[PDB]
Amino acid sequence: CFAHQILQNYFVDFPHPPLDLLQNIDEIIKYNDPILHQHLKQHNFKFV
Amino acid sequence: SLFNERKYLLLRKKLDELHYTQPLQIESAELVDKLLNDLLKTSEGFQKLKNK
Amino acid sequence: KILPLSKTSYNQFTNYNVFNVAHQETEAEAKLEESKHKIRQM
Amino acid sequence: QMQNRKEEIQILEMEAQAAARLRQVMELREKEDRQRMVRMDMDIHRQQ
Amino acid sequence: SRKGIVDYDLNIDAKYLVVISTLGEKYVYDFHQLIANQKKHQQDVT
Amino acid sequence: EEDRDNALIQQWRVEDTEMRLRRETLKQKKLQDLYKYEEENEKKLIEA
Amino acid sequence: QQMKKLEEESRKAIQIAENSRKADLDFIDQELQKKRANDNKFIASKMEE
Amino acid sequence: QLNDLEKLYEEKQDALMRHERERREIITYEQEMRYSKLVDAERQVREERL
Amino acid sequence: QSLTDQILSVEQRYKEKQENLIRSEQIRREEVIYNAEQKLSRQMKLEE
Numbered sequence: 001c002f003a004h005q006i007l008q009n010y011f012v013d014f015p016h017p018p019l020d021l022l023q024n025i026d027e028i029i030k031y032n033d034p035i036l037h038q039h040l041k042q043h044n045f046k047f048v
Numbered sequence: 049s050l051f052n053e054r055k056y057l058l059l060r061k062k063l064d065e066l067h068y069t070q071p072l073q074i075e076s077a078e079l080v081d082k083l084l085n086d087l088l089k090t091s092e093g094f095q096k097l098k099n100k
Numbered sequence: 101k102i103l104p105l106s107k108t109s110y111n112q113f114t115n116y117n118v119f120n121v122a123h124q125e126t127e128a129e130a131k132l133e134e135s136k137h138k139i140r141q142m
Numbered sequence: 143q144m145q146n147r148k149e150e151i152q153i154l155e156m157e158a159q160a161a162a163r164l165r166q167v168m169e170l171r172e173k174e175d176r177q178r179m180v181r182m183d184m185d186i187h188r189q190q
Numbered sequence: 191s192r193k194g195i196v197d198y199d200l201n202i203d204a205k206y207l208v209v210i211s212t213l214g215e216k217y218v219y220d221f222h223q224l225i226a227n228q229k230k231h232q233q234d235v236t
Numbered sequence: 237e238e239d240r241d242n243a244l245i246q247q248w249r250v251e252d253t254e255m256r257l258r259r260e261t262l263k264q265k266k267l268q269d270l271y272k273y274e275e276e277n278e279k280k281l282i283e284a
Numbered sequence: 285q286q287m288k289k290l291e292e293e294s295r296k297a298i299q300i301a302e303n304s305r306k307a308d309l310d311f312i313d314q315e316l317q318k319k320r321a322n323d324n325k326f327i328a329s330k331m332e333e
Numbered sequence: 334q335l336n337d338l339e340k341l342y343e344e345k346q347d348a349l350m351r352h353e354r355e356r357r358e359i360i361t362y363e364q365e366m367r368y369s370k371l372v373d374a375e376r377q378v379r380e381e382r383l
Numbered sequence: 384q385s386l387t388d389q390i391l392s393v394e395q396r397y398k399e400k401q402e403n404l405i406r407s408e409q410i411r412r413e414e415v416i417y418n419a420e421q422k423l424s425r426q427m428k429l430e431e
Contacts, residue, residue: 003113004104013176014117015183016405019398027394047401048408051357052192057364058356075191085349119279120180123187130423137430147245153334158256159290160336163297165263165388167340168396169271174351175399177278179406181358184282186413257384264388274302281313301348308352315359319366326373333380 022048055081 003010012018026047030037040046056077062084063070070080104111198209200221207221289296298304 001104004111005102008102008113009115011113011115011117013402013405014120015409016179016402019401019405022401023394023398046404047398048404049192054357054361055353058353058360061360062356078192081353085345089345117180117279119283120183120187123190125190134426134430144245151249155252155256155287156334157336158260159287160340161385161388162260162263162290163294163337164340165260165392166267166270166294167344168392169267170274171343171347172395172399173271173275173278174347176402177275178351178354179402180279181282181355182406182410185358189417260388261384264391277306278309281309284313301344305348305351308355312355312359315363319359319363322370323366326370330373330376330379333383 017048019048052077059084 009021010018012020026037053074056074059077059081060070063080066084193211193213193215195209196212196214198207200207205220205222206218207224208216208218210216
């Protein structure tokens, strides 16, 4: 049930992780105080 | 550069398949590759033009 | 909106890339047979 | 400016046509790389 | 050429030039020797 | 009315944009399906 | 007239690519089937007696 | 105005890499799987010993 | 509306770089693990 309601998009790719959510989370945080992204981008840190 | 060596294989092999000689080295393999890459498309584009 | 409630069925997680799944190795034999090799030597 | 509009509009609409195709182009270029990865993963299954 | 250059700089003692590949490899070499080597060899290629 | 006609530039110009964009978003829906159709066809060839 | 030929260009822009690329995989499928056939025939034959 | 000029090079080039990769896989595999089946050909010395 | 779609291209485009990071992590760790398994093969030296 958890997999269906929560983990519905935690696979997506494979063996690769759910890049879509690794991005969705990064869109949050960019919204929610973008200064982190200024730094993460500056030093090449990525979603995932 | 393993990802490159393994293309040089394929290139030399395609050249022999299509009966090209090749007493040469890997340097310029990409030259040769580009030449086939287009030759096998332009020769076609040209025949297709003729057909039309 | 997922709320996978069915008294008749359970849902497949239909985001599973069937193509690179269902194949870990286990092979107890991979190593126990070396024990057996030595046993044969014994 | 009807002449400058005539020119600007054709400049723009032509690009819009490029965008009109590029949306599909990206999907299949993505497919190629994602699938290229998938192949490599099945190769791992063969390595097992 | 499979490993091309991203950037470069010269030691003031110009005999050595260092060029850095796009993979971060620093090719450190005698610059004078290299000009003379490739210029003279490439001289007869035609 | 000349001024109406000038307004008609922009009014029909944007409808041109409007119908074009209706199609542009409809692309986006169709192209995500284009992607899977090709990815799925490959995934099975590999599987067989 | 462009906008219509340009829409028809999806076919002139070659949906055929799907077919050409598919053909390349139809080929890779048979070629990979031959090398796996080799692996299997050979591991299979070099045994048992 | 010319945004449909590029795209073609990338379609071409990406297809080329798509094909180089599939070809890279089969040649490498056809080559080594070939040496692998050869080893099996060598394994059937042993029937000779059998 | 074009920007929304431009955004989808940026989102969906950028994902490729993280897919590249993902394969970097995915391969590299498995590559190490199954270099560690080469000592299974050293333990085949055992049998020699």
